[PDB]
Every structure is written in structure tokens, then in C-alpha cells.
Amino acid sequence: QSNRELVVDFLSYKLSQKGYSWSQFAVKQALREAGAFSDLTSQLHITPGTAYQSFEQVVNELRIVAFFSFGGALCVESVDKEMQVLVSRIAAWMATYLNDHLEPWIQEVPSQKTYQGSYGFRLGFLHSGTAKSVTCTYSPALNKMFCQLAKTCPVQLWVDSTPPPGTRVRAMAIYKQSQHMTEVVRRCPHHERCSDSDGLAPPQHLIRVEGNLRVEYLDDRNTFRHSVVVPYEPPEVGSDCTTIHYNYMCNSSCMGGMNRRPILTIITLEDSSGNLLGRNSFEVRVCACPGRDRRTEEENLR
Ligand SMILES: [Zn+2]
Numbered sequence: 001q002s003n004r005e006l007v008v009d010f011l012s013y014k015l016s017q018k019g020y021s022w023s024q025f026a027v028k029q030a031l032r033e034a035g036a037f038s039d040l041t042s043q044l045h046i047t048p049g050t051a052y053q054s055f056e057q058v059v060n061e062l063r064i065v066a067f068f069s070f071g072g073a074l075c076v077e078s079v080d081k082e083m084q085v086l087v088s089r090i091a092a093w094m095a096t097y098l099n100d101h102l103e104p105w106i107q108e109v110p111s112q113k114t115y116q117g118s119y120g121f122r123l124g125f126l127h128s129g130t131a132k133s134v135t136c137t138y139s140p141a142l143n144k145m146f147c148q149l150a151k152t153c154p155v156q157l158w159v160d161s162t163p164p165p166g167t168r169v170r171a172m173a174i175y176k177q178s179q180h181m182t183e184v185v186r187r188c189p190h191h192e193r194c195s196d197s198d199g200l201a202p203p204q205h206l207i208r209v210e211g212n213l214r215v216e217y218l219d220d221r222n223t224f225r226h227s228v229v230v231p232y233e234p235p236e237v238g239s240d241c242t243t244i245h246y247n248y249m250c251n252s253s254c255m256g257g258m259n260r261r262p263i264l265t266i267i268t269l270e271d272s273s274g275n276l277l278g279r280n281s282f283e284v285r286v287c288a289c290p291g292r293d294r295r296t297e298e299e300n301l302r
Contacts, residue, residue, distance in 0.1 A: 003103075007068065007094045010035070011087065014072030020079055025087045035069030041113045043178065045283070046074055048083060049141035049301045055093050064102055068094075080114045081143070081280075082122065109181060110174060110225065112266055112281045120160025121269045121278030124241050130291040137290050141298055144283040145265070146290030149251050150196060152210055155267065157232070157242040166272035167232040171207050171246060172225060176262040176283060184224050187250040188257030196249065201228070206257075207265065210245035232269065248286045 012022040013032050044051060044058055059067060071094045078086040098106075116122065125138035125145070135151040138144070147153045157169060173185040186192075186204050193203070201208040202217050205226045209215045218227040228246075235241055246265075250257045262283060269278040287293045 003098060004091070004095050007071065007091050007098075010068045011072055011075050011091055011094075014076060015087075018076055018079075020076075025079070025084050031065060031068055034065045035072065037073070038111075040070060040073050041077065041111075042181070044074070045143070045176070046078060046081070046083065046086060047141065047143040048085065049298070050143070051086070052302065053093070055090075056097060059097055059101070064105070067097075067102065077114065080116065083143075110172060110223075110266060111279070112174065112264055113279065114281065115276075115279050116160075117269065117276075117278035118161060119163045119269065119277055120158075121280065122158035123267060123280045123282065124156030124158050126154050126156075130295045132289055132291050134291040137294050138282075139294050139298060141301060142283065144285065144294075144297070146285050146287060146294045147248055148288065148290060149191075149286055150247050150249055153246040153248065155244050155246055157244065157267070157269070158240075159242075162234050163232060163269065163277060164271070167277070168229050168270045168272070169232050169242075169244060170227055170229040170268045170270055171209075171244075172227045172266045172268075173206055173263050173284070174225075174266065175258075176264050180261050184226065185263055186226060186257065188254040190256065191250045191254065201249075202226070206248060206250050206263075208247040208249055210247055212245075229270075248284060251286045251288075252284075253287070 006028065009028045010031055015022055071090050074090050075087040078084060078090065128134050128137045130137060136147040136153050145153065175181050175183060175185060185206055187206055197203060198208060200215055205217055205228065207228050209228055209230055212230050214231050216229050218229065230244060233242060252258055253260050262285065264281050265284050266279060266281045268276055270276055285293060
């Protein structure tokens with residue numbers, strides 16, 4: 001009732017420290033200045049369903065200032081990822097955690113960080129359901145894509161402002177887990193050696209693009225990380241978004257490759273000189289029956 005005020009203060013500050021308002025969604029001011037940041041992005045995966053109470057585990061790791069601050073950045077990151085609703089909860093959680101854990105003490109390696117940038121860069125997805133005949137479906141609640149191997153994956157790009165000609169769109173994959181984040185993601189020997197090649201993609205790259213001769217693939221010479229890039233094109237006549245068709249050419253369960261380890265995909269928006277304009281990411285599971293797998297994860301939620 002007053003402890004809530006201290007949190008909501010800290011957040012509402014951090015809200016207004018950016019271009020955001022509480023309603024849209026002293027020692028107080030001492031903390032407003034006082035405030036391993038990769039923890040906040042990497043180790044957590046904030047998501048409507050996710051962070052159900054994985055927040056508690058994260059804060060248990062660890063200061064009380066860094067706690068109040070931590071929750072501020074979550075809310076920033078929440079609104080960044082278009083997951084504004086969570087700011088409501090993060091405060092509700094933050095209020096509870098203090099009371100339970102901290103209150104007694106008081107009674108006495110590519111970045112996956114989201115940036116919308118100048119152009120207001122967002123990812124859209126078709127809303128395709130979970131019927132067993134779906135090849136490709138996205139869980140907003142899990143911020144997770146479910147698709148079959150070598151099947152079409154529409155990923156929409158959305159922009160506030162049209163970025164100039166020579167802008168490019170690059171996809172890269174990394175492991176969601178910290179213990180695997182340094183290992184480069186690549187295909188498994190079987191799929192690697194398969195008469196499936198489009199004539200363009202390296203045999204070894206997980207992510208391909210479909211129906212685009214202007215595509216281009218990269219093995220970074222210093223990090224050995226695989227990438228695929230295409231030229232950005234503004235929406236076609238009628239549409240309000242750009243649609244790229246990706247393929248995942250190896251399953252999540254494949255031994256010799258991902259070996260049942262979950263991945264993130266990182267879509268970055270670049271200029272011709274390769275300066276970064278924006279970044280967005282989502283989880284991927286490549287499975288046999290995406291519709292079923294999606295439902296099963298979501299059915300587990302509250
Ligand atoms: Zn494979």
C-alpha cells in the first residue's frame with residue numbers, strides 16, 4: 001500500500017525516463033539515480049505466459065537497489081517487445097517478492113536485446129491456429145514459433161517509417177540456454193548431406209529464405225556464426241507489412257545438431273553500410289506437428 005508506491009514510483013520514473021506513462025498501461029529520488037545487465041535479457045525470457053514466477057528464481061540469485069532497477073528495465077523491455085500488459089504484473093510481482101524475501105532485511109555472443117529504432121521495427125506473424133494440418137504457427141504467449149522442417153515460415157516485418165533503399169534484413173540463430181550460447185548453431189550431418197539444396201544456401205546453414213534469388217548467406221570470419229540476409233523491400237500494393245519466407249532445415253530433436261536444445265532467432269534491420277537499425281527475436285521449435293506441440297505448451301499455462 002506504501003511499499004507498492006515505492007515500486008510503482010521507480011517503474012513510473014523509468015517509464016517516464018523513456019517515452020511512456022503509467023496510466024497508458026526523497027529516498028525515492030535517491031533510488032532514481034542509484035539505478036551483468038545481460039542477465040535481464042538473456043537469462044530471463046519475459047513473455048505474456050513466461051515469467052509466470054520465474055521472476056522469483058531470477059531475483060533469488062541475488063542489490064535491493066539492483067532489484068528495483070531490474071524491474072524497471074523489464075518494463076522498458078516489456079513495452080519494447082510490445083508486451084506492455086506485463087508492466088501491470090511486474091509491479092504486482094515486485095511488490096510480493098519484497099514482502100516475502102527482502103522486506104525482513106529492511107524491517108531492522110550476439111545480443112538479443114530488442115530495439116525498434118528510428119523506423120519502429122516490429123515482427124508480425126500470421127494467425128494460423130493449432131489444427132494438425134498447420135505447417136507453421138506462432139505462440140504470442142510464449143513468443144515462440146512452431147514449424148515443420150523445410151516448410152514455409154512467414155515472418156512479417158512492420159515499420160513506423162519506411163527505411164531507405166539498400167536496407168537489409170538479416171536472420172541469425174543462437175541457443176536460448178546460457179550453457180550453449182557460445183556454441184554456433186548449425187545443421188546435423190544427415191540434413192547437412194541431403195539432396196534438398198536450393199543452389200544458394202550453404203549445406204550447413206539452418207535458416208534459409210524462400211523464393212528470393214537476391215538472398216545472401218554469411219559465415220562470420222571471426223565468430224563463425226551463420227547468417228542469412230535479404231534486401232528490405234517496402235510492403236506490396238495493398239499490404240501493410242513485408243513478408244519474408246524462412247525455412248528451418250533441421251529439427252529441434254536432431255542429434256548431430258541442436259540435439260534437443262531450444263534456439264532463438266534474431267532478426268536485425270541493417271543499412272547498406274551494415275549499421276544496425278533494429279532488432280527483434282523469437283524462440284523456435286522445429287517439430288513434426290507444430291499445432292499439437294503449440295497447444296500442449298499453452299495448455300500448461302494458467
Ligand atoms: Zn537435422
